[PDB]
Paper text:
Members of the ring-forming Hsp104/ClpB family of ATP-driven molecular chaperones are the principle protein disaggregases in fungi (Hsp104), plants (Hsp101), and eubacteria (ClpB). At the molecular level, Saccharomyces cerevisiae Hsp104 forms a homo-hexamer that is stabilized by adenine nucleotides. Each Hsp104 monomer features two ATP-binding domains, termed AAA-1 and AAA-2, in addition to an N-terminal (N) domain and a coiled-coil motif that mediates the physical interaction with Hsp70. It is now widely accepted that Hsp104 facilitates the unfolding of aggregated proteins and the threading of substrate through the protein translocation channel analogous to ATP-dependent Clp proteases.
Author numbering: 6 to 343
């Protein structure tokens, strides 16, 4: 059985073949599936690998597409897509590779490596001036010692869940999408000092929801980019948790928790510091909601999760009363009306 992501690649591969007028599914359709631009703004598994190796990805897409239109299109298109000879070899090759790595499932990793054995794929790569061997090293670099023992272990990038369910504010500040903050110099400076602490290094902005707490977070993100922060915060990423994105699409039981776990995992296992801002932390922390709290609280206790919280005075006092460990983990910062 394939992974969730690998199955998606295969499904999209034949979907592309169906979009075109090709009767047979070929290896190039899988390659085209890998470079397919997702609508969720995620970074495709193969895109990351190619542009991580300092290769030209735009050129690569052009070659693949010009090779996908090069093959004849059947005007009397039949309602049946049978796998070609080359494809069958690839799929079988992917099963061999996953068994050699003692993986539990056939991931997009194995499929990619199987494509590298195909003649047409190799010719495409050589035509796109992209060295397959260098790409192989990237994939090995990405996965590392991580075994595919689950149907969702073959994540595309180390920031897949963060890119889907959170907003990179540091990137937004760098891209010039954030308006400059005015009159919050003290709150901004206080939030930064706390983040740079050793003990109780998690800021929690306290105030009425009718105030601009997110402005402070934007200010902090801008300071980080300009290196106007202590050395420990330099080069850090500041993400804002998007609760709306988390629940959107989550139609099954346990779907929310899986997405939340995926986000926290990418943060805790990140080589570079990542700060997570949670606008309504009491909706995920307070005694009223212990479902998502059983995910966030253990993560915070492991000490590899730096979080900027935001809540009201009444709600803050509520979480404190229910759990006295919150006071030792979070440093309250009052935000008043300017």
């Amino acid at each position: 059985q394939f992974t969730e992501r690998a199955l998606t690649i295969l499904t999209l591969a034949q979907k592309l073949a169906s979009d075109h007028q090709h009767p047979q599914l070929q290896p190039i359709h899988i390659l085209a599936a890998f470079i397919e631009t997702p609508e969720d703004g995620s970074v495709p598994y193969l895109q990351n690998l190619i542009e991580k190796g300092r290769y030209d990805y735009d050129l690569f897409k052009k070659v693949v597409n010009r090779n996908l239109v090069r093959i004849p299109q059947q005007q009397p298109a039949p309602a049946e897509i049978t796998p070609s000879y080359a494809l069958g070899k690839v799929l079988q090759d992917a099963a061999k590779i996953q068994k050699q790595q003692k993986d539990s499932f056939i991931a997009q990793d194995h499929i990619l490596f199987a494509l590298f054995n195909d003649s047409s794929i190799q010719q495409i790569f050589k035509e796109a001036q992209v060295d397959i061997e260098a790409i192989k090293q990237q994939a090995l670099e990405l996965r590392g010692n991580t075994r595919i023992d689950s149907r969702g272990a073959d994540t595309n990038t180390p920031l897949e869940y963060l890119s889907k369910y959170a907003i990179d504010m540091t990137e937004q500040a760098r891209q010039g999408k954030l308006d400059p903050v005015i009159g919050r110099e003290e709150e901004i400076r206080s939030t930064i000092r706390v983040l740079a602490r050793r003990i109780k290094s998690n800021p929690c902005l306290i105030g009425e929801p009718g105030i601009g707490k997110t402005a402070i977070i934007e200010g902090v993100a801008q300071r980080i980019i300009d290196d106007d922060v202590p050395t420990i915060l330099q080069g850090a990423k500041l993400f804002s948790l998007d609760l709306a994105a988390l629940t959107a699409g989550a139609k099954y039981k346990g779907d929310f928790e899986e997405r939340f776990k995926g986000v926290l995992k990418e943060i805790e296992e990140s080589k570079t510091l990542i700060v997570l801002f949670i606008d309504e932390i009491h909706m995920l922390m307070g005694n009223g909601k212990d479902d998502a709290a059983n995910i966030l609280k253990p993560a915070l206790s492991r000490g590899q999760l730096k979080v900027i919280g935001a809540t009201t005075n009444n709600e803050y006092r509520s979480i404190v009363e229910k759990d006295g460990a919150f006071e030792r983990r979070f440093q309250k910062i009052e935000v008043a009306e300017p």
